[PDB]
Amino acid sequence: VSASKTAQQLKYIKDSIKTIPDYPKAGILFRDVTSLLENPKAYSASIELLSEHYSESGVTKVVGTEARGFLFGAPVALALGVGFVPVRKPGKLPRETISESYELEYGTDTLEIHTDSIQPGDKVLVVDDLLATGGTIEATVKLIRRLGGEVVHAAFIINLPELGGEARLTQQGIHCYSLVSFD
Amino acid sequence: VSASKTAQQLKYIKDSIKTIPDYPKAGILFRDVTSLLENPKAYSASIELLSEHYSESGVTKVVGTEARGFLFGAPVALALGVGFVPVRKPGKLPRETISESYELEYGTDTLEIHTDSIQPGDKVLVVDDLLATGGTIEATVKLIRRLGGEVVHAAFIINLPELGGEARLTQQGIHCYSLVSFD
Ligand code: NA
Ligand code: NA
């Protein structure tokens, strides 16, 4: 596709995301991916661009974190013809799990994954809506690699590179692909 | 499709869901839809059967509740070519919302929806993974109807009719379609 037509599609996706001022607090801008979800053309385009980007990568599994990550991961898995494996806050997955901690602003939290859902060999794509500090993604990577899965790719709708996520993931050997970014 | 072949596909979907004994507590059986998600054939079939069921219904919007509902709702929206509108626990949606309470075992909780995402005219399908007591779905319906959307359909992967969900939704004029059910 011509750079003209690719730019028009990427712009249509970016213009579909709303910017909310002073949310969650004063002096913070919040990029709301829900306006993208309600526009079938923008939502379907975002899934196409993500899935196509990895169509030759030999991905065997897609992992997305709860909750907004499920919105992009699971359609990407469907588009690639591969299973989808959720990573969840603790006590939600019923079968045997492993766990990893991560930092929040005011405390720590954990993510879990089903131990039976990743096995040695698997080539795992991580998908999430937004890359900010990268802490949940760094935890997820650890989870996947502990179960013997290989992960070198993470994909997002939005990157906020100033929050350091992309730079942190790079340190773990993760290449990040984001449809759009903001300052 | 022949009743033979339809039964084989529906069986393949049902056999993909695992039954976990004594979860979340003793003497309760938990039906785990994550084993279905990791099987691309079963996951893709479940989306096809849900989307096809409504292909003539004039649906203009799909609503799913956080979090496992996003797993089925959002691919159904994509398959139908319509927007997806999340219903979330409180303080997660950034734009103007309305709210509805529902009962849990030990307390009350609320769900929210973006007021701008449903407008008069809209014909709304609700999708969720599992129909149990139906309290979250009954709240969601109220939300949609308050914004002027019409909702007469809710779709699920799993129905547990003994917990009363299906019977409660019926009282609100909701027809429920579930791929599988358990006792
Ligand atoms: Na494993
Ligand atoms: Na409205």
Side-chain angles (χ1 to χ4, degrees):
Chain A
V1 152
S2 58
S4 184
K5 266 200 144 77
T6 304
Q8 201 193 253
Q9 181 190 39
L10 196 64
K11 178 187 219 288
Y12 182 92
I13 295 176
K14 188 168 191 174
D15 298 343
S16 78
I17 299 162
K18 293 189 201 296
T19 294
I20 312 316
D22 303 306
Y23 185 104
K25 74 188 164 131
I28 302 281
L29 284 166
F30 183 83
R31 310 310 177 155
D32 177 10
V33 86
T34 66
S35 46
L36 176 159
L37 299 169
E38 59 195 331
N39 174 342
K41 180 160 274 164
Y43 188 19
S44 73
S46 72
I47 307 309
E48 145 193 335
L49 283 176
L50 295 176
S51 54
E52 315 230 317
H53 190 85
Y54 297 100
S55 74
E56 301 302 293
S57 294
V59 166
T60 66
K61 285 299 190 347
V62 171
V63 164
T65 57
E66 152 169 31
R68 287 194 304 246
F70 284 3
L71 298 166
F72 305 98
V76 167
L78 287 153
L80 293 171
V82 305
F84 176 72
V85 178
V87 165
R88 300 211 66 176
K89 320 179 143 85
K92 290 172 179 179
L93 287 171
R95 292 183 275 147
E96 187 195 333
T97 57
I98 52 164
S99 198
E100 282 292 334
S101 285
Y102 62 101
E103 316 280 61
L104 311 142
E105 192 141 33
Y106 296 103
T108 73
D109 209 348
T110 72
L111 290 176
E112 294 185 340
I113 200 175
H114 275 154
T115 67
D116 297 320
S117 295
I118 305 296
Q119 64 207 23
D122 277 333
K123 293 178 72 146
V124 190
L125 174 63
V126 177
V127 179
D128 199 13
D129 60 327
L130 186 142
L131 179 57
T133 66
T136 53
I137 314 297
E138 176 176 55
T140 298
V141 166
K142 285 187 179 136
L143 293 171
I144 287 162
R145 293 183 172 158
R146 294 172 46 201
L147 303 172
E150 282 160 28
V151 46
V152 305
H153 295 300
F156 308 87
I157 306 297
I158 301 167
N159 190 27
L160 307 176
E162 288 173 34
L163 302 175
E166 174 171 19
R168 170 191 309 212
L169 295 176
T170 288
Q171 301 311 303
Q172 272 180 311
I174 304 301
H175 307 294
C176 300
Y177 170 58
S178 297
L179 300 188
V180 308
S181 93
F182 299 95
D183 303 311
Chain B
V1 152
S2 58
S4 184
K5 266 200 144 77
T6 304
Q8 201 193 253
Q9 181 190 39
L10 196 64
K11 178 187 219 288
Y12 182 92
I13 295 176
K14 188 168 191 174
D15 298 343
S16 78
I17 299 162
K18 293 189 201 296
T19 294
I20 312 316
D22 303 306
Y23 185 104
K25 74 188 164 131
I28 302 281
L29 284 166
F30 183 83
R31 310 310 177 155
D32 177 10
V33 86
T34 66
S35 46
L36 176 159
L37 299 169
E38 59 195 331
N39 174 342
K41 180 160 274 164
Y43 188 19
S44 73
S46 72
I47 307 309
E48 145 193 335
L49 283 176
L50 295 176
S51 54
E52 315 230 317
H53 190 85
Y54 297 100
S55 74
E56 301 302 293
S57 294
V59 166
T60 66
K61 285 299 190 347
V62 171
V63 164
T65 57
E66 152 169 31
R68 287 194 304 246
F70 284 3
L71 298 166
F72 305 98
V76 167
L78 287 153
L80 293 171
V82 305
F84 176 72
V85 178
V87 165
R88 300 211 66 176
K89 320 179 143 85
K92 290 172 179 179
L93 287 171
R95 292 183 275 147
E96 187 195 333
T97 57
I98 52 164
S99 198
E100 282 292 334
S101 285
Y102 62 101
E103 316 280 61
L104 311 142
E105 192 141 33
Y106 296 103
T108 73
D109 209 348
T110 72
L111 290 176
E112 294 185 340
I113 200 175
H114 275 154
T115 67
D116 297 320
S117 295
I118 305 296
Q119 64 207 23
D122 277 333
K123 293 178 72 146
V124 190
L125 174 63
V126 177
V127 179
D128 199 13
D129 60 327
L130 186 142
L131 179 57
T133 66
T136 53
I137 314 297
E138 176 176 55
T140 298
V141 166
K142 285 187 179 136
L143 293 171
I144 287 162
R145 293 183 172 158
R146 294 172 46 201
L147 303 172
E150 282 160 28
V151 46
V152 305
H153 295 300
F156 308 87
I157 306 297
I158 301 167
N159 190 27
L160 307 176
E162 288 173 34
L163 302 175
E166 174 171 19
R168 170 191 309 212
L169 295 176
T170 288
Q171 301 311 303
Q172 272 180 311
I174 304 301
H175 307 294
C176 300
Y177 170 58
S178 297
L179 300 188
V180 308
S181 93
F182 299 95
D183 303 311

Coordinates of all heavy atoms in Angstrom, one line a residue, chain A residues 36-110:
Chain A
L36 N -12.3 4.5 19.9 CA -11.8 3.7 18.8 C -12.6 2.4 18.8 O -13.1 2.0 17.7 CB -10.3 3.4 19.0 CG -9.7 2.5 18.0 CD1 -8.2 2.7 18.0 CD2 -9.9 1.0 18.3
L37 N -12.9 1.8 19.9 CA -13.7 0.6 20.0 C -15.1 0.7 19.4 O -15.6 -0.2 18.8 CB -13.8 0.1 21.4 CG -12.6 -0.3 22.1 CD1 -12.7 -0.5 23.6 CD2 -12.1 -1.5 21.4
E38 N -15.7 1.9 19.6 CA -17.0 2.1 19.1 C -17.1 2.5 17.6 O -18.2 2.6 17.1 CB -17.8 3.2 19.9 CG -17.2 4.6 20.0 CD -17.9 5.4 21.1 OE1 -19.0 5.1 21.4 OE2 -17.2 6.3 21.7
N39 N -16.0 2.7 17.0 CA -15.9 3.0 15.5 C -15.5 1.7 14.8 O -14.3 1.3 14.8 CB -15.0 4.1 15.3 CG -14.8 4.4 13.9 OD1 -15.0 3.6 13.0 ND2 -14.3 5.6 13.6
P40 N -16.4 1.0 14.1 CA -16.1 -0.4 13.6 C -15.0 -0.3 12.6 O -14.2 -1.2 12.5 CB -17.4 -0.8 12.9 CG -18.4 0.2 13.1 CD -17.8 1.3 13.9
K41 N -14.9 0.8 11.8 CA -13.9 0.9 10.9 C -12.5 1.1 11.5 O -11.5 0.5 11.1 CB -14.2 2.1 9.9 CG -13.2 2.5 8.9 CD -13.9 3.3 7.8 CE -14.5 2.4 6.7 NZ -15.5 3.1 5.8
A42 N -12.4 1.9 12.5 CA -11.1 2.1 13.2 C -10.6 0.9 14.0 O -9.4 0.6 14.1 CB -11.2 3.3 14.2
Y43 N -11.6 0.2 14.6 CA -11.3 -1.0 15.5 C -10.9 -2.1 14.6 O -9.8 -2.7 14.8 CB -12.5 -1.3 16.3 CG -12.4 -2.4 17.4 CD1 -11.1 -2.8 17.8 CD2 -13.5 -3.1 17.9 CE1 -11.0 -3.7 18.8 CE2 -13.3 -4.0 18.9 CZ -12.1 -4.3 19.3 OH -12.0 -5.3 20.4
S44 N -11.6 -2.4 13.5 CA -11.2 -3.4 12.6 C -9.9 -3.1 11.9 O -9.1 -4.0 11.7 CB -12.4 -3.7 11.6 OG -12.4 -2.6 10.7
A45 N -9.6 -1.9 11.6 CA -8.3 -1.5 11.0 C -7.2 -1.8 11.9 O -6.1 -2.2 11.5 CB -8.2 0.0 10.6
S46 N -7.4 -1.4 13.2 CA -6.3 -1.6 14.2 C -6.0 -3.1 14.4 O -4.8 -3.5 14.4 CB -6.7 -1.0 15.5 OG -7.7 -1.8 16.1
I47 N -7.0 -4.0 14.3 CA -6.8 -5.4 14.4 C -6.0 -5.9 13.1 O -5.1 -6.8 13.2 CB -8.0 -6.2 14.7 CG1 -8.8 -5.7 16.0 CG2 -7.8 -7.7 14.7 CD1 -7.9 -5.6 17.2
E48 N -6.5 -5.5 12.0 CA -5.8 -5.8 10.7 C -4.3 -5.4 10.8 O -3.5 -6.2 10.4 CB -6.6 -5.2 9.6 CG -5.7 -4.8 8.4 CD -6.6 -3.9 7.4 OE1 -7.8 -4.1 7.3 OE2 -5.9 -3.1 6.7
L49 N -4.0 -4.2 11.2 CA -2.6 -3.7 11.2 C -1.7 -4.5 12.1 O -0.6 -4.8 11.8 CB -2.5 -2.3 11.5 CG -3.0 -1.3 10.4 CD1 -2.9 0.1 10.9 CD2 -2.0 -1.5 9.2
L50 N -2.3 -4.7 13.3 CA -1.5 -5.6 14.3 C -1.3 -7.0 13.8 O -0.3 -7.5 13.9 CB -2.3 -5.6 15.6 CG -2.4 -4.3 16.4 CD1 -3.2 -4.5 17.7 CD2 -1.0 -3.8 16.7
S51 N -2.4 -7.7 13.3 CA -2.3 -9.1 12.9 C -1.3 -9.2 11.7 O -0.5 -10.1 11.7 CB -3.6 -9.7 12.6 OG -4.3 -8.9 11.7
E52 N -1.4 -8.3 10.7 CA -0.6 -8.4 9.5 C 0.8 -8.2 9.8 O 1.6 -8.9 9.2 CB -1.0 -7.3 8.5 CG -2.5 -7.1 8.3 CD -3.1 -7.2 6.9 OE1 -2.4 -6.5 6.0 OE2 -4.1 -7.8 6.7
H53 N 1.1 -7.3 10.7 CA 2.5 -7.0 11.2 C 3.2 -8.3 11.6 O 4.4 -8.5 11.3 CB 2.6 -6.0 12.3 CG 4.0 -5.6 12.6 ND1 4.6 -4.5 11.9 CD2 4.9 -6.0 13.6 CE1 5.8 -4.3 12.5 NE2 6.0 -5.2 13.5
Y54 N 2.5 -9.2 12.2 CA 3.1 -10.5 12.7 C 2.8 -11.8 11.8 O 3.1 -12.9 12.3 CB 2.6 -10.8 14.1 CG 3.1 -9.7 15.0 CD1 2.3 -8.6 15.4 CD2 4.4 -9.6 15.4 CE1 2.7 -7.6 16.1 CE2 4.9 -8.6 16.2 CZ 4.0 -7.6 16.6 OH 4.5 -6.6 17.3
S55 N 2.2 -11.6 10.7 CA 1.7 -12.8 9.9 C 2.8 -13.8 9.5 O 2.4 -14.9 9.3 CB 1.0 -12.3 8.6 OG 2.0 -11.8 7.7
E56 N 4.0 -13.4 9.4 CA 5.2 -14.2 9.1 C 6.0 -14.6 10.3 O 7.1 -15.1 10.1 CB 6.1 -13.5 8.1 CG 5.5 -13.1 6.8 CD 4.9 -14.3 6.1 OE1 5.7 -15.2 5.7 OE2 3.7 -14.5 6.0
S57 N 5.6 -14.3 11.5 CA 6.5 -14.3 12.6 C 6.5 -15.7 13.3 O 7.2 -15.8 14.3 CB 6.1 -13.3 13.7 OG 6.3 -12.0 13.1
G58 N 5.7 -16.6 12.9 CA 5.6 -17.9 13.5 C 5.0 -17.9 14.9 O 5.3 -18.7 15.7
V59 N 4.2 -16.8 15.2 CA 3.5 -16.8 16.5 C 2.6 -18.0 16.7 O 1.9 -18.3 15.8 CB 2.7 -15.4 16.6 CG1 1.7 -15.5 17.7 CG2 3.7 -14.3 16.7
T60 N 2.8 -18.7 17.8 CA 1.9 -19.8 18.2 C 0.8 -19.5 19.3 O -0.1 -20.3 19.5 CB 2.6 -21.0 18.6 OG1 3.3 -20.7 19.9 CG2 3.7 -21.4 17.6
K61 N 0.9 -18.3 20.0 CA 0.1 -18.0 21.1 C 0.0 -16.5 21.2 O 1.1 -15.8 21.1 CB 0.7 -18.5 22.5 CG 0.6 -20.0 22.8 CD -0.8 -20.5 22.9 CE -0.9 -21.9 23.5 NZ 0.3 -22.7 23.6
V62 N -1.1 -15.9 21.6 CA -1.1 -14.5 22.0 C -1.5 -14.4 23.4 O -2.5 -15.0 23.8 CB -2.1 -13.7 21.1 CG1 -2.3 -12.3 21.6 CG2 -1.8 -13.7 19.7
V63 N -0.8 -13.5 24.2 CA -1.0 -13.2 25.6 C -1.5 -11.7 25.7 O -0.9 -10.9 25.1 CB 0.2 -13.5 26.4 CG1 0.0 -12.8 27.8 CG2 0.4 -14.9 26.6
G64 N -2.6 -11.5 26.4 CA -3.0 -10.2 26.8 C -3.4 -10.1 28.2 O -3.9 -11.1 28.8
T65 N -3.1 -8.9 28.8 CA -3.4 -8.7 30.2 C -4.8 -8.1 30.3 O -5.3 -7.4 29.4 CB -2.5 -7.7 30.9 OG1 -2.6 -6.5 30.1 CG2 -1.0 -8.2 30.9
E66 N -5.4 -8.4 31.4 CA -6.7 -7.9 31.8 C -6.6 -6.4 32.0 O -5.6 -5.9 32.5 CB -7.1 -8.7 33.0 CG -8.0 -8.0 34.0 CD -8.5 -9.0 35.0 OE1 -7.8 -10.0 35.3 OE2 -9.7 -8.9 35.4
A67 N -7.6 -5.6 31.8 CA -8.8 -5.9 31.0 C -8.8 -5.4 29.6 O -9.2 -6.1 28.7 CB -10.1 -5.4 31.7
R68 N -8.2 -4.2 29.4 CA -8.3 -3.6 28.0 C -7.4 -4.3 27.0 O -7.7 -4.3 25.8 CB -7.9 -2.1 28.0 CG -9.0 -1.3 28.7 CD -8.9 0.2 28.4 NE -7.6 0.6 28.9 CZ -7.4 1.4 30.0 NH1 -8.4 2.1 30.6 NH2 -6.1 1.7 30.3
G69 N -6.4 -5.0 27.5 CA -5.6 -5.8 26.7 C -6.3 -6.9 26.0 O -6.0 -7.3 24.8
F70 N -7.4 -7.5 26.6 CA -8.2 -8.5 26.1 C -8.9 -8.1 24.8 O -9.1 -8.9 23.9 CB -9.3 -8.8 27.1 CG -8.9 -9.6 28.3 CD1 -7.6 -10.0 28.5 CD2 -9.9 -10.0 29.2 CE1 -7.3 -10.8 29.7 CE2 -9.7 -10.8 30.4 CZ -8.3 -11.1 30.6
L71 N -9.2 -6.8 24.7 CA -9.8 -6.1 23.6 C -9.0 -6.1 22.3 O -9.6 -5.9 21.2 CB -10.3 -4.7 24.0 CG -11.3 -4.7 25.0 CD1 -11.5 -3.3 25.6 CD2 -12.7 -5.2 24.6
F72 N -7.7 -6.1 22.4 CA -6.8 -6.2 21.3 C -6.1 -7.5 21.1 O -6.0 -8.1 20.0 CB -5.9 -5.0 21.3 CG -6.7 -3.8 21.4 CD1 -7.0 -3.1 22.6 CD2 -7.2 -3.2 20.2 CE1 -7.8 -2.0 22.6 CE2 -8.0 -2.1 20.2 CZ -8.3 -1.4 21.4
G73 N -5.7 -8.2 22.2 CA -5.1 -9.5 22.1 C -6.0 -10.6 21.5 O -5.5 -11.3 20.7
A74 N -7.2 -10.7 22.0 CA -8.0 -11.8 21.7 C -8.4 -11.7 20.1 O -8.3 -12.6 19.4 CB -9.2 -11.8 22.5
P75 N -8.8 -10.4 19.7 CA -9.0 -10.4 18.2 C -7.8 -10.7 17.3 O -7.8 -11.3 16.2 CB -9.6 -9.0 17.9 CG -10.2 -8.6 19.2 CD -9.3 -9.2 20.3
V76 N -6.6 -10.2 17.8 CA -5.4 -10.5 17.1 C -5.1 -12.1 17.1 O -4.8 -12.6 16.0 CB -4.1 -9.8 17.6 CG1 -2.8 -10.4 17.1 CG2 -4.3 -8.4 17.2
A77 N -5.4 -12.8 18.2 CA -5.2 -14.2 18.2 C -6.2 -14.9 17.2 O -5.8 -15.7 16.4 CB -5.5 -14.8 19.6
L78 N -7.4 -14.4 17.2 CA -8.4 -14.9 16.2 C -7.9 -14.7 14.8 O -8.1 -15.5 13.9 CB -9.8 -14.3 16.4 CG -10.5 -14.8 17.7 CD1 -11.5 -13.8 18.3 CD2 -11.2 -16.2 17.6
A79 N -7.4 -13.5 14.5 CA -6.9 -13.1 13.2 C -5.7 -14.0 12.8 O -5.6 -14.3 11.6 CB -6.6 -11.7 13.1
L80 N -4.8 -14.4 13.7 CA -3.7 -15.2 13.4 C -4.0 -16.7 13.5 O -3.1 -17.4 13.2 CB -2.6 -14.9 14.5 CG -1.9 -13.5 14.4 CD1 -1.0 -13.2 15.5 CD2 -1.3 -13.3 13.0
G81 N -5.2 -17.1 13.9 CA -5.5 -18.5 14.1 C -4.8 -19.2 15.2 O -4.5 -20.4 15.1
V82 N -4.4 -18.5 16.3 CA -3.7 -19.1 17.4 C -4.5 -18.9 18.8 O -5.4 -18.1 18.9 CB -2.3 -18.5 17.6 CG1 -1.5 -18.6 16.3 CG2 -2.3 -17.0 18.0
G83 N -4.1 -19.6 19.8 CA -4.8 -19.5 21.0 C -4.5 -18.2 21.7 O -3.4 -17.6 21.5
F84 N -5.4 -17.9 22.5 CA -5.3 -16.6 23.4 C -5.2 -17.0 24.8 O -6.0 -17.9 25.3 CB -6.5 -15.8 23.2 CG -6.5 -14.5 24.1 CD1 -5.6 -13.5 23.8 CD2 -7.1 -14.5 25.3 CE1 -5.4 -12.4 24.7 CE2 -6.9 -13.4 26.2 CZ -6.1 -12.4 25.9
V85 N -4.2 -16.5 25.5 CA -3.9 -16.8 26.9 C -4.0 -15.5 27.7 O -3.2 -14.7 27.6 CB -2.6 -17.4 27.0 CG1 -2.3 -17.8 28.5 CG2 -2.4 -18.7 26.2
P86 N -4.9 -15.5 28.7 CA -5.0 -14.3 29.5 C -4.0 -14.3 30.6 O -3.8 -15.3 31.2 CB -6.4 -14.3 30.0 CG -6.8 -15.7 30.1 CD -6.0 -16.4 29.0
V87 N -3.5 -13.1 31.0 CA -2.8 -12.8 32.2 C -3.7 -11.9 33.1 O -4.3 -10.9 32.6 CB -1.5 -12.1 31.9 CG1 -0.8 -11.5 33.1 CG2 -0.6 -13.2 31.3
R88 N -3.9 -12.4 34.3 CA -5.0 -11.8 35.1 C -4.5 -11.4 36.5 O -3.5 -11.9 37.0 CB -6.1 -12.9 35.3 CG -6.7 -13.2 33.9 CD -8.2 -13.6 34.1 NE -9.0 -12.5 34.4 CZ -10.3 -12.5 34.6 NH1 -11.0 -13.7 34.5 NH2 -10.9 -11.5 34.9
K89 N -5.2 -10.5 37.1 CA -4.9 -10.2 38.5 C -5.2 -11.5 39.3 O -5.9 -12.4 38.8 CB -5.8 -9.1 39.0 CG -6.0 -7.9 38.0 CD -7.0 -6.9 38.7 CE -6.6 -5.4 38.3 NZ -7.2 -5.0 37.0
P90 N -4.7 -11.6 40.6 CA -4.7 -12.8 41.3 C -6.1 -13.3 41.8 O -7.0 -12.5 42.0 CB -3.7 -12.6 42.5 CG -3.7 -11.1 42.6 CD -4.2 -10.5 41.4
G91 N -6.3 -14.6 41.7 CA -7.4 -15.3 42.2 C -8.5 -15.4 41.2 O -9.7 -15.7 41.6
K92 N -8.2 -15.1 39.9 CA -9.2 -15.2 38.9 C -9.1 -16.4 38.0 O -10.1 -16.8 37.4 CB -9.3 -13.9 38.1 CG -9.9 -12.8 39.0 CD -9.7 -11.5 38.3 CE -10.3 -10.3 39.1 NZ -10.0 -9.1 38.3
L93 N -7.9 -16.9 37.8 CA -7.7 -18.0 36.9 C -7.8 -19.2 37.8 O -7.3 -19.2 38.9 CB -6.3 -17.9 36.4 CG -6.0 -16.8 35.3 CD1 -4.5 -16.7 35.0 CD2 -6.8 -17.1 34.0
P94 N -8.6 -20.2 37.4 CA -8.9 -21.4 38.3 C -7.9 -22.6 38.3 O -8.0 -23.4 39.2 CB -10.3 -21.9 37.8 CG -10.2 -21.6 36.4 CD -9.4 -20.3 36.2
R95 N -7.1 -22.7 37.3 CA -6.2 -23.8 37.2 C -4.9 -23.4 37.7 O -4.7 -22.3 38.2 CB -6.1 -24.3 35.7 CG -7.4 -25.0 35.2 CD -7.1 -25.5 33.8 NE -7.3 -24.4 32.8 CZ -6.7 -24.3 31.7 NH1 -5.7 -25.2 31.5 NH2 -6.9 -23.4 30.8
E96 N -3.9 -24.3 37.7 CA -2.6 -24.0 38.3 C -1.9 -22.8 37.6 O -2.0 -22.7 36.4 CB -1.7 -25.2 38.2 CG -0.3 -25.0 38.9 CD 0.7 -26.0 38.5 OE1 0.4 -27.1 38.1 OE2 1.9 -25.7 38.6
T97 N -1.5 -21.9 38.4 CA -0.8 -20.6 38.0 C 0.5 -20.4 38.5 O 1.0 -21.1 39.4 CB -1.7 -19.4 38.4 OG1 -1.9 -19.4 39.9 CG2 -3.0 -19.4 37.8
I98 N 1.3 -19.5 37.8 CA 2.5 -18.9 38.4 C 2.2 -17.4 38.5 O 1.3 -16.9 37.8 CB 3.8 -19.2 37.7 CG1 3.7 -18.9 36.2 CG2 4.2 -20.7 37.9 CD1 5.1 -18.8 35.6
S99 N 3.0 -16.7 39.2 CA 2.8 -15.3 39.6 C 4.0 -14.5 39.4 O 5.1 -15.0 39.6 CB 2.4 -15.3 41.1 OG 1.8 -14.1 41.3
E100 N 3.9 -13.2 39.1 CA 4.9 -12.2 39.1 C 4.4 -10.9 39.6 O 3.3 -10.5 39.3 CB 5.5 -11.9 37.7 CG 6.4 -13.0 37.1 CD 7.8 -13.1 37.9 OE1 8.3 -12.1 38.4 OE2 8.3 -14.2 37.8
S101 N 5.2 -10.3 40.5 CA 5.0 -8.9 41.1 C 5.4 -7.8 40.1 O 6.2 -8.0 39.3 CB 5.8 -8.7 42.3 OG 5.2 -9.4 43.4
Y102 N 4.8 -6.6 40.3 CA 5.2 -5.4 39.6 C 4.9 -4.3 40.5 O 4.1 -4.4 41.4 CB 4.5 -5.3 38.2 CG 3.0 -5.1 38.2 CD1 2.4 -3.9 38.0 CD2 2.2 -6.2 38.2 CE1 1.0 -3.7 38.0 CE2 0.8 -6.1 38.2 CZ 0.2 -4.8 38.1 OH -1.1 -4.7 38.2
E103 N 5.5 -3.1 40.2 CA 5.3 -1.9 40.9 C 4.1 -1.1 40.4 O 3.9 -0.9 39.2 CB 6.5 -1.0 40.8 CG 7.9 -1.7 41.0 CD 8.2 -2.0 42.5 OE1 7.5 -2.7 43.2 OE2 9.3 -1.4 42.9
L104 N 3.3 -0.6 41.3 CA 2.4 0.4 41.0 C 2.9 1.7 41.7 O 3.9 1.7 42.4 CB 1.0 0.1 41.5 CG 0.5 -1.3 41.1 CD1 -0.3 -1.8 42.3 CD2 -0.4 -1.2 39.9
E105 N 2.3 2.9 41.4 CA 2.6 4.1 42.1 C 2.7 3.9 43.7 O 3.7 4.3 44.3 CB 1.7 5.2 41.8 CG 2.3 6.5 42.3 CD 2.0 7.7 41.3 OE1 1.0 7.6 40.6 OE2 2.9 8.6 41.2
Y106 N 1.7 3.2 44.2 CA 1.6 3.2 45.7 C 1.6 1.9 46.4 O 1.1 1.8 47.5 CB 0.2 3.9 46.1 CG 0.2 5.4 45.7 CD1 -0.4 5.8 44.6 CD2 1.0 6.3 46.5 CE1 -0.4 7.1 44.2 CE2 0.9 7.6 46.1 CZ 0.3 8.1 45.0 OH 0.3 9.4 44.7
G107 N 2.3 0.9 45.8 CA 2.2 -0.4 46.3 C 2.6 -1.4 45.1 O 3.2 -1.0 44.1
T108 N 2.3 -2.7 45.4 CA 2.7 -3.7 44.4 C 1.5 -4.5 44.1 O 0.5 -4.5 44.8 CB 3.8 -4.7 45.0 OG1 3.2 -5.6 45.9 CG2 5.0 -4.0 45.6
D109 N 1.5 -5.1 42.9 CA 0.4 -6.0 42.5 C 1.1 -7.2 41.8 O 2.3 -7.2 41.6 CB -0.6 -5.3 41.7 CG -2.1 -5.9 41.9 OD1 -2.3 -7.0 42.5 OD2 -3.0 -5.1 41.4
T110 N 0.2 -8.2 41.6 CA 0.8 -9.4 40.9 C -0.1 -9.7 39.7 O -1.3 -9.3 39.6 CB 0.8 -10.6 41.9 OG1 -0.5 -11.0 42.2 CG2 1.4 -10.1 43.2

